[PDB]
Amino acid sequence: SKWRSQLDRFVKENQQDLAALFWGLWLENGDSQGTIGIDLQPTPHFVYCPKDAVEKLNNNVENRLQELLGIIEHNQPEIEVLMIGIGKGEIKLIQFAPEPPPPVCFEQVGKDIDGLLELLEQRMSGEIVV
Amino acid sequence: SKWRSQLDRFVKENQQDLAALFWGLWLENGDSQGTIGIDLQPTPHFVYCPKDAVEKLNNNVENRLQELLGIIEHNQPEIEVLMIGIGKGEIKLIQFAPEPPPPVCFEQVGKDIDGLLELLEQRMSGEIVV
Amino acid sequence: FRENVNAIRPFGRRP
């Protein structure tokens, strides 16, 4: 369960980059692919999590985050980032309202979602570690 | 000028103690006093923002803040810390999902509401400037 | 707005 705190510290340190990626992918997909996830195994990587899959994962007794689907539906992406971390079947909610807001974060990085994704995954590989 | 990034940095650096204060106040009051705010003037201090007050603000800004009312209604306090940052004629959403969640933060920090209020206001004093 | 919010004060260390 130590991964939850490691991921939480990574998120606190990388809010600008995560917000830029969040907004860029949202510009591409909205919620049509589901929620942005970080699957920590075999190494941390971004994945899309369809709503139906999130709900079934959360209904396991190891999770049961109360009203999670409502939290996902109510998150306002132009103000706030939401993702989920997944480690050995267990969900950790990632949510924060960054400064500047996600659309500005994305404009500051430019049109390089692929490079941002690679950078965040390379960083995560040494920063969420068993 | 600098208060947005200063507030954002203070929140990121103090998520666990802010979550502990948020949960302690939830235990005491529920939403009976309104939403917790951080008023940056004349010095940074915690306030309660009654629903009626937030409505009046939204009306006076011609509904630019309509999404804030919904964010307040739907907040899940077991998972999400919610606070209203009050700058100079400007408000900033504070919403984040800490690790561990707010009830565990309050138990683990082991400080009462008085001690959390005092330590957090001391920490903001001089670091957030309007 | 600020006129309509209410300070959250510590009870304080009462003498």
Numbering used by the authors:
A (entry chain A), B (entry chain B): 13 to 142
C (entry chain D): 1 to 15
Please, what does the article write about this entry?
Here, we determined the structure of the chaperone protein CcmS, which has recently been identified to be involved in β-carboxysome assembly, and its interactions with β-carboxysome proteins.
After a period of crystal growth, we obtained high-quality crystals and solved the 1.67 Å crystal structure of the CcmS/CcmK1-C15 complex in space group P41212 by molecular replacement. In the refined structure, each asymmetric unit contains a CcmS dimer and a CcmK1-C15. CcmK1-C15 binds to one side of the CcmS dimer along the longitudinal direction through hydrogen bonds and salt bridges. The polar contacts between CcmK1-C15 and CcmS involve Arg101-Asp51, Arg101-Gln53, Ile107-Phe58, Asn105-Tyr60, Phe110-Asp126, Gly111-Asp126, and Arg112-Glu130 interactions. Furthermore, these amino acid residues involved in the interactions between CcmS and CcmK1-C15 are conserved, implying a general interaction manner of CcmS and CcmK1 among different cyanobacterial species. Intriguingly, superposition of the crystal structures of CcmS alone and the CcmS/CcmK1-C15 complex revealed that the binding with CcmK1-C15 resulted in conformational changes of CcmS. In particular, the α-helices in the W38-P89 region underwent a rotational shift, including the conformational change from a random curl to an α-helical structure. Additionally, the β-sheets in the I98-I103 region near CcmK1-C15 became less ordered. In the crystal structure of the CcmS/CcmK1-C15 complex, we found that one CcmK1-C15 peptide could also bind to the CcmS dimer of the neighboring asymmetric unit via Arg108-Asp51, Gly111-His57, and Arg112-Tyr60 interactions.
